[PDB]
Amino acid sequence: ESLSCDASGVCDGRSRSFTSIPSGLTAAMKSLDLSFNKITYIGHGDLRACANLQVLILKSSRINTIEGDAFYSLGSLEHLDLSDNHLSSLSSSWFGPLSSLKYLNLMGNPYQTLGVTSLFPNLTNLQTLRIGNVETFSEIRRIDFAGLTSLNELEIKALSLRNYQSQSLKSIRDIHHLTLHLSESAFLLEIFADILSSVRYLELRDTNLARFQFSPLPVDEVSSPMKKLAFRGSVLTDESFNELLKLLRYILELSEVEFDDCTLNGLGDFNPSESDVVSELGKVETVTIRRLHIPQFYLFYDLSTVYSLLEKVKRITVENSKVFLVPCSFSQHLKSLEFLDLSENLMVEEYLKNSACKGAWPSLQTLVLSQNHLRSMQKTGEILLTLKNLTSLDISRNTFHPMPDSCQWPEKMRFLNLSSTGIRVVKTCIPQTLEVLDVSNNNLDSFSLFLPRLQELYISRNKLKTLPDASLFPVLLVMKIASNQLKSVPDGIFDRLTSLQKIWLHTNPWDCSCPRIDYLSRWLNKNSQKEQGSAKCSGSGKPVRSIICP
Amino acid sequence: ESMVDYSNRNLTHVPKDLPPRTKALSLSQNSISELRMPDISFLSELRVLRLSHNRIRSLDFHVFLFNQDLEYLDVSHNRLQNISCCPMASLRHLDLSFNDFDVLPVCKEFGNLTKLTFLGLSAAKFRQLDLLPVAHLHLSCILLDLVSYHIKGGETESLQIPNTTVLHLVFHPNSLFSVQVNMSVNALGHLQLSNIKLNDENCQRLMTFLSELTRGPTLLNVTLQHIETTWKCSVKLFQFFWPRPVEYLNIYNLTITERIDREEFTYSETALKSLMIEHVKNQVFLFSKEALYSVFAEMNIKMLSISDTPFIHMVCPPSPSSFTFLNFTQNVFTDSVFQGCSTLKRLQTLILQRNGLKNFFKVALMTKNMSSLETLDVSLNSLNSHAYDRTCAWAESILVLNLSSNMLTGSVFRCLPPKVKVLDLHNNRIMSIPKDVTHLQALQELNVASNQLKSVPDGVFDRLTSLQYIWLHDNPWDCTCPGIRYLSEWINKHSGVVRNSAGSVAPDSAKCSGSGKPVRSIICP
């Protein structure tokens, strides 16, 4: 039964069970939030008082009818959120007076269309439109987006699109990021043609692409702005690849493809037209696949029908998709590949030995095999010798057996991430060449390791009673060595760390006894710059940058 | 046992200084070359003498004249070629395997070795009757190695093997298996072959050699060790065994070899109770995984174990199988294993320990139609109960469920087999506990040890009326009085119920985040 507020002017009337817009509103209010109530009705005078309001958040209340002129006096309002209400239909009158509006979210309302009069023509300041719904938004007409020339974010949620009039999205000159939700492919070809010259990033959501057929577009030779293409929750078949790949012929400038929580009801039996395979995926440098569900993942094909298509790509991500082998021939065909991220898969040295064959991944500089099932650092590093250009490896989140004294690694490996790796000792396995080492979140009792070049040394969340000798790394730049078991570090330790420029010590059971905590106490002060995280005194909570001693 | 171990001591003679009444002496792995009487005369009490891995050329059994008590002599891995014909009657274990004997050194006097139980031999030539002198002893192991053996003038060599519990045969470790000796056996409990290298060209050579050691009186076990073989040949090896009297078949350190194609096979009535494969290296990378996995899936035995391999999956049997035991330890299996598999309705115990099972709720949907499942060990995987779709469909029949050592959170109690009796959830990540721990009232053992639990909602362990074991240790319990009372009154009222990280009664086991004080010590008024 209470509306609050704050000094700035940010009133918060959230889940107080209202049946009407809170009585008495002030011209001091800059941001009103009346979400999640039963404001079934907004009336003529309900919002005349707060004429200086920049933000009106009415999300998911119970709003089913809003008088036409409800918003007339809100002429400074830039953020309007009516999502998730029972607006059975929309009025052209609500938005006319809001010449200051930048953001307007209308999704979540049971309207069938956007009504018979353009809603947005007089909104020269609009940057973000969100319309549509899951179960009833069914038509898209050419009037619907008249008067809109540019938008940062357009989000049409049209899962139930029964009909899309030709050329609806074409009048819009520039769209920075269009998010479409279609349940099936019936209109994708038609809409894709309308956004060839406007959209800069297309995100397609929740689409059954199972039986998607391509065919040449009516459109004229228009150079497309589109640089990113992303499929969120799509169902795809091996056929879909063959057709979808044909779309890139219209978006020559494209440089990134992404597939998110997508299902592939297939096995990689791709047969790409030959025109497309000569193109080598155009200007697409980066390909990203996350959580691709493949029902019979184990029956997956050679994937050799695309070995030529991908000779030019530079960054590939295939995360949490049950990858268990990148066939050697594939690897040798990924000539131009610089970044490879195979996190959260099924790689084991046995497969990795094939996937990194003698001629594999020639340009690879970064390998990421986090959260796979590796169990021997010696076997791993030795397999990877095939990678001559490898300069940074991440085999973290892999429950390794104890590393030995003698290992080999890529002679240019400057970055090794062994975090969360279960280890409890560090031997001379780790190569001297290492400029960055991350051995945090483990069971290390002592880091006692000569690594000259070593700049950074992330080694937090450990059981380290004692701090490492400052000779072990003469050119050191950083040392994240928090959440540890440090009682107190020897006075005169950052002497030969004439290089250290940032440090971590927080969350640590120390010992702030005036007779002993001399050095630390005053060094942390001289260079408060070189330091993030505030050291907690054991039992006091008082910072170590505090009181010094005579 | 009164022992002196002098192995790797670089020795040359038998240390004349040793304690006179010594009983077990090992001079293994040295450079002793001759063994004269005055070398061991004094050790009158000697029972055991291990001389494995030396350089002795001749061995005179009279040399042991004064060791009337010697029962274990191991002169394997030397360079023996000559041998006194009469071994000491005191022998129970005589090992002469891996030497340089032309022909089996078993003389007629070996009959006097009535107490003999282990016999180890090696040779390069075999005649049918060579082991006749020991055919009337109640032997337990005959170790025999054909490392020294080459093929000869086609006139097939024979060799009658005396009745033994175990027959262990070791071959040359660096070549295609090429034995043509005809080996008979009457009574055999366990045949065991080591160092088997096959392609398709010598596959049959092995099947023939096995044919006669395998002809059956009763049942016997077979063990293959270090087999590197074609896939074609492996599918043959299985088929060769199926009709034969082999109850347990075991394979250790298998290496699949040149290609994996679809091979012909049918499994008919068999004596086989158990296939067990452990440690599988695979050198083929491109092949139809059906061609490999179906060969096992369609097997009509009761127990299949396949462990420590690169395998990523197992196919669901095409027809109702008779598997009642499945153990796929330490592979790379996923939660899609046996998805909606309605053809393991006899399966009682399934073991998926040490794999890549991700989605705890997919792992529940797996057992949906496993009408006989009582034990499910999906431990040491990568499980977690954060699934978007948290729908439960457990087999109503599970009694023992090892979920220990994953990344399970607390929602894990929203979804547990109706009639569970054992629930090992140790080494997980549970703080998040729900009010569903009493809608599952039949447990007897419980292990929520090594977790992240601070407190436990008041009134759980009350309805766990059948509880009797509970591992509460290694948890960061909040011991501030307003809410640590319930657990303290509990541990005390049930002192015997709480076990430790070892297995014995211990109410101390539960400790506090701060002092380390036993939670049952605390008194909140």
């Binding site: 997956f300 094909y301 050679d302 050799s304 082998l325 066939p327 | 990378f285 491109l286």
Partner: peptide
């Protein structure tokens, strides 16, 4: 992985 059907 598997090769095709030739």
């Amino acid at each position: 992985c598997s090769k095709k059907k030739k």
